[PDB]
């Protein structure tokens, strides 16, 4: 199953780290003092449609 590119930090099934998907149950972050995209575990949100 595929997702798509995040549209908001915190998500975790989107193309967070690179074109690779992060990890549901985790939390991604777009723009972190320079990191336009990080994949840091944590309760974020299942990037809805």
Curated annotation (Swiss-Prot):
Q: What is the effect of changing residue 4 to A?
A: Decreased affinity for thrombin
**GO terms of biological process kind:** negative regulation of serine-type peptidase activity
Give the primary localization class.
secreted
Where does the protein end up?
Answer: Secreted
Q: Which GO terms describe its cellular component?
A: extracellular space
Cysteines engaged in disulfide bonds, as pairs = 6-14, 16-28, 22-39
**Which residues does the annotation flag as glycosylated?**
45
Query: Which spans are transmembrane here?
Result: none
Query: What is the protein named?
Result: Hirudin variant-1
Of the parent protein, the shown chain spans 1 to 49 of 65
């Amino acid at each position: 199953v595929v997702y798509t590119d995040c549209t908001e930090s915190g998500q975790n099934l989107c193309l967070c780290e690179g074109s690779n998907v992060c990890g549901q149950g985790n939390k991604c972050i777009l723009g972190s003092d320079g990191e336009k995209n990080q994949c840091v575990t944590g309760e974020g949100t299942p990037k809805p449609q």
